[PDB]
Design a protein around this ligand. Structure first.
Ligand SMILES: CCCCS(=O)(=O)Nc1ccc2cnn(C)c2c1
Ligand SMILES: CCCCS(=O)(=O)Nc1ccc2cnn(C)c2c1
Ligand code: NA
Ligand code: NA
Lengths: 413, 413
């Protein structure tokens, strides 16, 4: 059974929304990327100087979430819940605010951590003034399922509200599970993607102590260098992204113009290391292959790969092998983290949206800072200027800390 | 397409393990439940007196997790990761330490929050001595996928390692996603269940401030009263539980004796309120109905319902209506939280293990403290003494905060 042979129903993407370090509008982010713009700049936050952080570069949201948040929302929601509500409403507006059947409507939103800022706040409030100072809203804000719950409550999703956690692959895995919920018959329509918290001292400190982050502080826009010889780790780039997916029949019934097709989703694991990807990239490649199997495609059909491309030395090397294992080494490769950075749980979702626009507009943006290619890798990396091309099919890769491999297979409508 | 009509492959439960407030051995916990034992006692912890908490009753694990943990594990892992390692090894040994194909082996372990203690630790450390005092493993310990990532690395699962966060239904949802992974053909064997943190002052404060918790401190063992007229909220009971599921062919090939059959799983949502369940129980009942559709069963086939049964006035009323909607109100109902309390993300997995043991031994333990029937409920609640029977099929219910509904359909082997 596959999408090609009619074993699974046809699933199409009908709307996308995203907020990034370049722009709060996905179509503006897309234009910026095509122009070779970067969202990564020098961090001017006071916490950088306070702690004298080794990492002084980051990509803040161009339009911060809380600028669209009144006092009420600031009191009753965690940050990721607030981002979810914002993106949830924008997405629904862009889809024409359709009246769908709630019992056939599901929500699957991934996240890296959850409402962690409310944990420390409640911790502090209890330490200072005792258990009565902990809010009765604390549980619903802290719980990592909260963002998905807020969106499901907002839009009225009654065919399931799910939250997969797989670190960097959470946003892509969310879309994978949304696809599954539809193809198994549990829903006809689904909002899916990923949300994540902002850059701060403690996140910077924590990830910096892993020694996986770039420290090229003097040249922020040149710091993130996926598949480049002079790469020194990943760069934080704040993001949130959701897409609306549904059966082609459902889309056709309400007159929705599809942006792209979601043909298959592959989920595998390494069982190798807690934070480092497997060097051979076999299991990561198997995730790509599995998505092709479910889509009913062969590697030869894959014209484009939106790479995970963290810019860690071992990460990019592993992925290069992974693509080769999947037999997609002839595909045109893009590494959006070169310009948008790493948004952890949201990044798989943001990059899935980018893959949809690639297929829609038939153009791949240039991978920034790809000046001196790494001799070992040997990939067809799109760079210099955007590459216009006849892209029929694409695979979006997302590989998370813990050994989590998610591959999504998309097709041009 | 169903399990009955051969649409899905036959999936069987071949091994179980759990640590509870009654015992570290699942077979001993099971005997205790049949004898009418309770794991809920007066909390002798210092934080109870220190803060003068409204709740002074809880069920700590009989055998603490850390009593099996050395110095490396205590510094390199979070609590839920440590619980995961322990139960992971115990399950594998109970299964006969089989040599499975890692590429067809998956792990799905749910949890409520994650390595939350390491967040407040990192926060305190950084505030005291700056960013360099934060642990290098802070990220891999804090990340909520960490428990599942530990177990997948421990046992060598390469067909996917996933963590669903669904609050009270996390453990059940994990089994649900494990079932899905096997039936869609991505794996043949799967370790699945749930883990959760211990009882502490802040967890108590957070849940008790919602007025969700029982305050019957004078009589700890009589506090948790699911479906009883005089019920006043849930009681904390620490737990962790995992089960080994696999296809019947795979089980037969290695000579593994099945304990029960996993026939189907239904996942729906309320989209009603952030913490309160929907009064009508319609979507909760649809979760039950969906598990039957996929199992290939009818409501008449269901002889047993392992209820969510938290003992909240609102929660039990909703579940009573949900069972009516599913057409399962003539089924024999058991509420294990009466004796084992609420373990949040692990409780759905624990009660799935209890459902398996019920179908294996053909006996339902008594629902503790069910003395005065509530007029509104009108359920056949097993109480006073255990009820023996040739039980053919059972449905395990989990309805978590956020409106997440998971129903698991089990069958006698
Ligand atoms: C730009 C992505 C990095 C953020 S993180 O990976 O540390 N997750 C994260 C999640 C929630 C909150 C709330 N406050 N903060 C600071 C958070 C951080
Ligand atoms: C017995 C179930 C209640 C625990 S909870 O729902 O508050 N989750 C939880 C998870 C992790 C940790 C670590 N320390 N602590 C205290 C934790 C607590
Ligand atoms: Na990607
Ligand atoms: Na149950």
């Amino acid at each position: 059974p596959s999408t090609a042979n009619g074993g699974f129903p046809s699933v199409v993407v009908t709307a996308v929304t995203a907020t990034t370090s370049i722009s709060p509008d996905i179509e503006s982010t897309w234009k910026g990327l095509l122009a070779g713009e970067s969202g990564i700049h020098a961090l001017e936050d006071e916490f950088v100087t306070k702690w004298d952080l080794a990492v002084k570069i980051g990509g803040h949201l161009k339009d911060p979430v809380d600028s669209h948040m009144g006092r009420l929302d600031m009191r009753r929601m965690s940050y990721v819940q607030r981002m979810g509500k914002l993106l949830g409403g924008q997405l629904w507006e862009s889809a024409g605010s359709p009246e769908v059947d709630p019992d056939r409507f599901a929500v699957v939103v991934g996240t890296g951590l959850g409402g962690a800022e409310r944990i420390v706040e409640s911790y502090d409030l209890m330490n200072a003034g005792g258990p009565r100072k902990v809010s009765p809203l604390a549980v619903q804000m802290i719980m990592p399922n909260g963002a998905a719950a807020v969106i499901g409550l907002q839009l009225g999703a009654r065919a399931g509200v799910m939250t997969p956690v797989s670190a960097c692959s959470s946003g892509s895995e969310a879309i994978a599970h949304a696809w599954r919920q539809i193809v198994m018959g549990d829903a006809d329509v689904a909002v899916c993607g990923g949300v994540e918290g902002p850059i701060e001292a403690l996140p910077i400190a924590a990830f910096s102590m892993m020694r996986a982050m770039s420290t090229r502080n003097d040249e922020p826009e040149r710091a993130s260098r996926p598949f480049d010889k002079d790469r020194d780790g990943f760069v934080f780039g704040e993001a949130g992204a959701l897409m609306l997916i549904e059966t082609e029949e459902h889309a056709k019934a309400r007159g929705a113009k599809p942006l792209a097709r979601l043909l298959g989703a592959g989920i595998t694991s390494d069982a190798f290391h807690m934070v480092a990807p497997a060097a051979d990239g076999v299991r990561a490649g198997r995730a790509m292959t599995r998505s092709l199997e479910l889509a009913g495609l062969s590697p030869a059909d894959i014209d484009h790969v939106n790479a995970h491309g963290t810019a860690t030395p071992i990460g990019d090397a592993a992925e290069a092998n992974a693509i080769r294992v999947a037999g997609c080494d002839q595909a045109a490769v893009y590494a959006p983290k070169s310009a948008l950075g790493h948004s952890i749980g949201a990044v798989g979702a943001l990059e899935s949206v980018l893959t949809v626009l690639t297929l829609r507009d038939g153009v791949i943006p240039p991978t920034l800072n790809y000046e001196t290619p790494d001799p070992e890798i040997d990939l067809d990396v799109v760079a210099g200027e955007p590459r216009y091309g006849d892209y029929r099919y694409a695979v979006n890769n997302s590989f998370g800390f813990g050994g989590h491999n998610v591959a999504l297979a998309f097709g041009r409508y």
